[PDB]
């Protein structure tokens, strides 16, 4: 998820900022041994604040500067930050 993307919410700008499968190399310069590092680096930082992260796409490169964002439907919180209970079995 986070050194490997795969599905993410929308209902954001997403210009410039896209995640389905792509590769993240590194944000604001600072490189990541695991996703753990990564998630741990944010650490809950998004709207407002402005980082840069570069893409790789079939062995390209691009820099844009975007304003990160907030879930428009739950400003009391930020990022999912994996939350999700295994109490949902499957009903």
Do not use: C
Request: net charge neutral.
């Amino acid at each position: 998820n986070g050194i490997y993307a795969s599905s993410v919410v929308e209902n954001m700008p997403a210009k410039g900022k896209i995640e389905v499968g792509d590769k993240i190399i590194s944000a604001d310069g600072k490189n990541y041994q695991s996703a753990e590092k990564l998630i741990d680096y944010i650490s809950s930082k998004k709207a407002g604040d402005k980082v840069t992260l570069k893409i790789e796409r079939e062995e390209k490169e691009k820099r844009v500067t975007l304003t990160l964002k907030q879930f428009p439907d739950e400003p009391d919180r930020a990022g999912i930050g994996v939350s999700l209970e295994h109490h949902h079995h499957h009903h």
